[PDB]
Each structure stands twice: as C-alpha cells, then as structure tokens.
Amino acid sequence: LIKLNTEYKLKLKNLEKRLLEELNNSQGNMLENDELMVTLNNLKKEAMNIEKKLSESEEFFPQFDNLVEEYSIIGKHSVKIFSMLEKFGQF
Amino acid sequence: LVTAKYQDLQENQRFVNVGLEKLNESKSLTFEKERWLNTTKQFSKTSQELIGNCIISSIYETYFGHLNERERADMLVILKRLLGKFAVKYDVNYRFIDYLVTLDEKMKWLECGLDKNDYFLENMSIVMNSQDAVPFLLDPSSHMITVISNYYGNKTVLLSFLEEGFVKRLENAIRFGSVVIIQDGE
C-alpha cells in the first residue's frame, strides 16, 4: 500500500498536468467542457482512494509496534545467544 | 540542502498560485477542486518545518556514517530532545530514507545488488547523495564495489594503492574523468 499510494500521488501529479493542458485549451468546445466532468469524477475517485488508504495506514503503527514486542523479546535473547557464541569462538 | 529545497518549495508555491490565478481568470463543483489551494496551509507547515527537517537530514548525511542502528537511534533521541530544547517545528514522525531518495533510485539501487535492509539503504543513500566530499567505503565484503560498478555501468576501474601503475592509470583516467574506486582503505 505504500508503493500504491506513492504511485497514486504520481498519478495525481499527471492529472495536474492534464488539468493545465486543458486550462491552456479554454472553454471553447462543449465536448471539452463535458469531458472534464468525467475527468473530475476520476479525480474524486483517486482522492477517495488516497483518503481510504491513508485512513487504513492510520491504525497500523499501533498494531505494528504492538507486534514488534514479540520480535523484540525474541531479539534481546538472540543477541545474548550470539554474544555467547562468539565468546566460544574467541575461546 | 536548504537552498535547494527552499527553491523547490518556492517553485511549488509559484505553480499552485499560478493555477489559482488561472482558475480565477478561467460549474459549482469546483469546491471539490480547490483542495489544491487549500493545501497552501500544508505547504506553509512544510515550509516552517523544513529547516529542522533539513537539519536532521544533514546530520544523517554527515554524522550517521559512524553509528550502528542502536547508536543512530540514541543520537536521534538526543538530537530531537535538544531540538525541543530550542523548539523548532518538524514532523515528529519522519523517515530519513523516504525523504531524500525516491522509490525510483531505491529500486535502481536494489537491482544493482543492495541488501534489503534499512541500514545499508541509508548508507548507500548517504554515500551516493553528497558529491562535495569524497566518500569512504568501509566494509569487509567486497560486493559493494560490484554493486557500485553495476550502478555506474562500464566505468569502474580496479586501482590499488599498492599498485605502482595506480598513479599512471589515475593520471590517465582523470583526463576523461572515468569513475575510479581504490580498494586500499588502509
């Protein structure tokens, strides 16, 4: 999801280029004044994707560092095992 | 870094203001579109925190070349506490590797053969990030030279201090500026 929202931000930048490309073209054509409806609809779809994925990422760091507790209780003994192993190695 | 990033945010603000003026001189649903200019306050907060963020980035680039993960974490705690002692704004949640290097360089370097761990990603980022001062590669494994050559393509030369032709080969390479890596750190 991290790479996904990074790609969606780059897609938003591309949409920004498209917005400027259009703004250079003015409101001369009714087709050009109606395709922006679906353009903004897709823009809002991307925006709600961004919002939902950011919201999903919001409640993960507490879960993440709750789950790292077990890995830490493993690691603080793994380091002791390592240290005694090279104690034998130097012995 | 502060010069470059302040310039970057300067053109970003110029571009968003140009977009706002263009919309001004251009439906009732544009209130869903003015979020781009409502991000001006976010740009302002990034402006008011980038000084400290670039600070800690500079200490990352320079100071953190001698520190392990534990030492780096302890130094971060110390430096953030002392930032608070001289309170200046900066995002409390912050990732170094997500700030100076984008995912493109990440996958390019990992394709060169980097180990998939945060420590070596940070080390590669800092070693290839600043070119003002020559960097010092420090490792027992020699695969670092291989991945450096992979990133550099067919430009790396194998020169050693103990080689007498190193002086001549270096004088040759400096003229057309091929990338040189010398393996005698001692």
PDB file of N, CA, C and O in Angstrom, chain A residues 6 12-13 16 19 23-24 27 37 40 43-44, chain B residues 12 19 22-23 26-27 29 32-33 35-36 103:
ATOM      1  N   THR A   6       2.144   5.935  -3.230  1.00  0.00           N
ATOM      2  CA  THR A   6       3.157   6.703  -3.949  1.00  0.00           C
ATOM      3  C   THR A   6       2.810   6.794  -5.433  1.00  0.00           C
ATOM      4  O   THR A   6       2.860   7.876  -6.038  1.00  0.00           O
ATOM      5  N   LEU A  12      -1.741  11.537  -9.485  1.00  0.00           N
ATOM      6  CA  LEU A  12      -2.348  12.836  -9.218  1.00  0.00           C
ATOM      7  C   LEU A  12      -1.537  13.957  -9.853  1.00  0.00           C
ATOM      8  O   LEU A  12      -2.100  14.931 -10.363  1.00  0.00           O
ATOM      9  N   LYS A  13      -0.208  13.841  -9.817  1.00  0.00           N
ATOM     10  CA  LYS A  13       0.637  14.822 -10.498  1.00  0.00           C
ATOM     11  C   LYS A  13       0.394  14.807 -12.005  1.00  0.00           C
ATOM     12  O   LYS A  13       0.334  15.864 -12.651  1.00  0.00           O
ATOM     13  N   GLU A  16      -2.659  16.557 -12.652  1.00  0.00           N
ATOM     14  CA  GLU A  16      -2.410  18.019 -12.558  1.00  0.00           C
ATOM     15  C   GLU A  16      -1.906  18.522 -13.919  1.00  0.00           C
ATOM     16  O   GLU A  16      -2.377  19.590 -14.367  1.00  0.00           O
ATOM     17  N   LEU A  19      -4.815  18.717 -16.155  1.00  0.00           N
ATOM     18  CA  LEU A  19      -5.639  19.902 -15.800  1.00  0.00           C
ATOM     19  C   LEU A  19      -5.056  21.139 -16.500  1.00  0.00           C
ATOM     20  O   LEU A  19      -5.836  21.887 -17.129  1.00  0.00           O
ATOM     21  N   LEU A  23      -6.574  23.621 -19.186  1.00  0.00           N
ATOM     22  CA  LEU A  23      -6.733  25.037 -18.890  1.00  0.00           C
ATOM     23  C   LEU A  23      -6.069  25.894 -19.957  1.00  0.00           C
ATOM     24  O   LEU A  23      -6.497  27.028 -20.199  1.00  0.00           O
ATOM     25  N   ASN A  24      -5.033  25.366 -20.610  1.00  0.00           N
ATOM     26  CA  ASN A  24      -4.472  26.046 -21.771  1.00  0.00           C
ATOM     27  C   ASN A  24      -5.452  26.092 -22.935  1.00  0.00           C
ATOM     28  O   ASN A  24      -5.348  26.986 -23.783  1.00  0.00           O
ATOM     29  N   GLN A  27     -12.487  27.172 -22.587  1.00  0.00           N
ATOM     30  CA  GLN A  27     -13.827  26.588 -22.682  1.00  0.00           C
ATOM     31  C   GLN A  27     -14.467  26.908 -24.035  1.00  0.00           C
ATOM     32  O   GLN A  27     -15.520  27.537 -24.129  1.00  0.00           O
ATOM     33  N   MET A  37     -16.105  16.683 -16.797  1.00  0.00           N
ATOM     34  CA  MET A  37     -16.958  16.057 -15.792  1.00  0.00           C
ATOM     35  C   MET A  37     -16.419  14.685 -15.399  1.00  0.00           C
ATOM     36  O   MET A  37     -16.234  14.393 -14.212  1.00  0.00           O
ATOM     37  N   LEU A  40     -13.024  15.072 -13.556  1.00  0.00           N
ATOM     38  CA  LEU A  40     -13.150  15.357 -12.132  1.00  0.00           C
ATOM     39  C   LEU A  40     -13.746  14.178 -11.375  1.00  0.00           C
ATOM     40  O   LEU A  40     -13.438  13.991 -10.196  1.00  0.00           O
ATOM     41  N   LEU A  43     -10.874  12.075 -10.823  1.00  0.00           N
ATOM     42  CA  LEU A  43     -10.051  12.759  -9.833  1.00  0.00           C
ATOM     43  C   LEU A  43     -10.578  12.529  -8.422  1.00  0.00           C
ATOM     44  O   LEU A  43      -9.803  12.265  -7.496  1.00  0.00           O
ATOM     45  N   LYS A  44     -11.897  12.617  -8.241  1.00  0.00           N
ATOM     46  CA  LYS A  44     -12.501  12.343  -6.940  1.00  0.00           C
ATOM     47  C   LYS A  44     -12.362  10.878  -6.554  1.00  0.00           C
ATOM     48  O   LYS A  44     -12.207  10.566  -5.369  1.00  0.00           O
TER      49      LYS A  44
ATOM     50  N   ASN B  12       7.115  25.341  -6.208  1.00  0.00           N
ATOM     51  CA  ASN B  12       5.844  24.672  -5.935  1.00  0.00           C
ATOM     52  C   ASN B  12       4.758  25.684  -5.578  1.00  0.00           C
ATOM     53  O   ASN B  12       3.631  25.617  -6.089  1.00  0.00           O
ATOM     54  N   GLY B  19      -1.778  28.327 -10.811  1.00  0.00           N
ATOM     55  CA  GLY B  19      -3.004  27.580 -11.042  1.00  0.00           C
ATOM     56  C   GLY B  19      -4.224  28.272 -10.465  1.00  0.00           C
ATOM     57  O   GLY B  19      -5.284  28.312 -11.094  1.00  0.00           O
ATOM     58  N   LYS B  22      -5.024  31.246 -12.656  1.00  0.00           N
ATOM     59  CA  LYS B  22      -5.584  30.755 -13.908  1.00  0.00           C
ATOM     60  C   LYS B  22      -7.039  30.345 -13.731  1.00  0.00           C
ATOM     61  O   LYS B  22      -7.884  30.639 -14.583  1.00  0.00           O
ATOM     62  N   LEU B  23      -7.351  29.660 -12.629  1.00  0.00           N
ATOM     63  CA  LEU B  23      -8.740  29.321 -12.336  1.00  0.00           C
ATOM     64  C   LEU B  23      -9.567  30.577 -12.095  1.00  0.00           C
ATOM     65  O   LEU B  23     -10.745  30.639 -12.471  1.00  0.00           O
ATOM     66  N   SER B  26     -10.341  31.928 -15.348  1.00  0.00           N
ATOM     67  CA  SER B  26     -10.911  30.940 -16.260  1.00  0.00           C
ATOM     68  C   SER B  26     -12.297  31.356 -16.736  1.00  0.00           C
ATOM     69  O   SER B  26     -12.606  31.277 -17.931  1.00  0.00           O
ATOM     70  N   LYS B  27     -18.780  25.495 -13.448  1.00  0.00           N
ATOM     71  CA  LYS B  27     -19.513  24.561 -12.601  1.00  0.00           C
ATOM     72  C   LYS B  27     -19.394  24.946 -11.132  1.00  0.00           C
ATOM     73  O   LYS B  27     -18.436  25.605 -10.728  1.00  0.00           O
ATOM     74  N   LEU B  29     -19.109  22.721  -8.730  1.00  0.00           N
ATOM     75  CA  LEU B  29     -18.415  21.646  -8.038  1.00  0.00           C
ATOM     76  C   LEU B  29     -16.918  21.895  -7.906  1.00  0.00           C
ATOM     77  O   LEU B  29     -16.192  21.005  -7.453  1.00  0.00           O
ATOM     78  N   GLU B  32     -14.778  21.102  -4.763  1.00  0.00           N
ATOM     79  CA  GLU B  32     -14.034  19.856  -4.661  1.00  0.00           C
ATOM     80  C   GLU B  32     -12.687  19.927  -5.368  1.00  0.00           C
ATOM     81  O   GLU B  32     -11.870  19.014  -5.207  1.00  0.00           O
ATOM     82  N   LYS B  33     -12.442  20.985  -6.141  1.00  0.00           N
ATOM     83  CA  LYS B  33     -11.178  21.172  -6.837  1.00  0.00           C
ATOM     84  C   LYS B  33     -10.240  22.138  -6.128  1.00  0.00           C
ATOM     85  O   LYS B  33      -9.025  22.061  -6.336  1.00  0.00           O
ATOM     86  N   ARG B  35      -9.176  22.028  -3.298  1.00  0.00           N
ATOM     87  CA  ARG B  35      -8.313  21.376  -2.319  1.00  0.00           C
ATOM     88  C   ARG B  35      -6.844  21.620  -2.638  1.00  0.00           C
ATOM     89  O   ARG B  35      -6.008  21.672  -1.729  1.00  0.00           O
ATOM     90  N   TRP B  36      -6.521  21.797  -3.921  1.00  0.00           N
ATOM     91  CA  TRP B  36      -5.144  22.067  -4.319  1.00  0.00           C
ATOM     92  C   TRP B  36      -4.643  23.379  -3.734  1.00  0.00           C
ATOM     93  O   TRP B  36      -3.464  23.501  -3.381  1.00  0.00           O
ATOM     94  N   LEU B 103      11.474   6.297  -4.688  1.00  0.00           N
ATOM     95  CA  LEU B 103      11.433   4.861  -4.938  1.00  0.00           C
ATOM     96  C   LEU B 103      12.153   4.469  -6.220  1.00  0.00           C
ATOM     97  O   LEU B 103      12.580   3.317  -6.347  1.00  0.00           O
TER      98      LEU B 103
END
